[PDB]
Amino acid sequence: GSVVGGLGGYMLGSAMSRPVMHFGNEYEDRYYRENQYRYPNQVMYRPIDQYGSQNSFVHDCVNITVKQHTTTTTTKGENFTETDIKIMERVVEQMCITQYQNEYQAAQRYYN
């Protein structure tokens, strides 16, 4: 994929748990379970500084996260398909949601 002229000074949100993924199908849901190991337990994000939302954080957080794997782990010997990315852009969504909260909470405690 791409980003606006190059990656935006993002950071890795440390390694969380492996959540489930529930699309509410059988195919996509099975495909996830079948490859649950390939999918990361990490996301990357921009500082809450930039924006100030769940959704705009989620959308960009996810959309960088995909790339990190599909721009670095690919040349380390991964073969993420685009179908594998549709999955990732939802499993990593739940992690991004938790990670916004994990930075916010972890900042408004002391104030910056």
- Total residue length of the chain: 112
Place of tokens 């996509």: 28
Domain ranges of the chain: 1-112
HSE, CB side, 13 Å, CA atoms: give it for residue 85.
17
Q: Determination method here?
A: NMR
Distances in Å between the alpha carbon of 109 and those of 13, 16, 19, 90, 106? Answer: 18, 21, 26, 29, 6
C-beta neighbour count of 77 within 10 angstroms: 6
Q: Which one of 3.40.50.920, 1.10.790.10, 3.40.50.10800, 3.30.70.120 gives the CATH number of domain 1-112?
A: 1.10.790.10
Cβ burial, residue 35 (10 Å; 0-12/13-18/19+): middle
